[PDB]
Amino acid sequence: GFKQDIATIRGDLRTYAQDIFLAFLNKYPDERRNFKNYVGKSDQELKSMAKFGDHTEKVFNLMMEVADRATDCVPLASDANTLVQMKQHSGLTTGNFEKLFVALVEYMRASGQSFDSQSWDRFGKNLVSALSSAGMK
């Protein structure tokens, strides 16, 4: 289920984070244009840039912290606050997050594995709603 999925992801976090972020960028090419250093790069080119590995790992670590702290796929209000607050996220609407989760759920459904895709969909929906409550437009 959802808690096991967190362990599955954590066990090979950089690999999952990279493949899921690539799925996002590839499904939603306009979102790539917000990452200047990743424009004009193939999947294998990104996987060799240090900030790409590092940044994906740090994003997914935080995502997994938020997932682990959630109750029944509902994140903590305080976690939503952090995500709205972060300087890094001053550009963003909740649409950006919705898209990430669509890509994540699709990746999970396509993978060989017994991810609880439905729970990740609900978690994403609940995170988006918590981001609105914490003030993201």
Ligand X SMILES: Oc1c(Cl)cc(Cl)cc1Cl
Which of ligand X, ligand HEM, none has residue 6 at its interface (CB below 5 to 8 Å by kind)? Answer: none
Q: Given 3-state DSSP classes, what are the helix, strand and coil percentages for the chain, each rounded to the nearest 5?
A: 75, 0, 25
CB 33 within 8 A of CB 82: no
What are the CA-CA distances from residue 94 to residues 111, 126, 130 (Å)? Answer: 26, 11, 10
Contact region with ligand HEM (CB under 6 A), list: 8-16, 38-46, 96-104, 114-122: 96-104
CB 113 within 8 A of CB 8: yes
Kindly state the smallest distance separating residue 17's Cβ from ligand X, in Å: 5
Contact region with ligand X (CB under 6 A), list: 6-14, 76-84, 97-105, 129-137: 97-105
Residue 63 touches ligand HEM, criterion: CB under 6 A: yes
Kindly state the smallest distance separating residue 39's Cβ from ligand HEM, in Å: 13
In the block, residue with structure tokens 């992801």:
9
Kindly tell me which residue out of 5, 9, 16, 52 binds ligand X, with binding defined by CB under 6 A.
Answer: 52
Structure tokens at 128: 């988006």
Q: Rounded to an integer, what distance in angstroms lies between the CA atom of residue 25 and that of residue 36?
A: 12
Q: Rounded to an integer, what distance in angstroms lies between the CA atom of residue 67 and that of residue 76?
A: 9
Kindly tell me which residue out of 104, 128, 131, 136 binds ligand X, with binding defined by CB under 6 A.
Answer: 104
Residue 17 touches ligand X, criterion: CB under 6 A: yes
Residue 103 touches ligand X, criterion: CB under 6 A: yes
Binding residues for heme b: 36, 38, 51, 55, 58, 88-89, 97
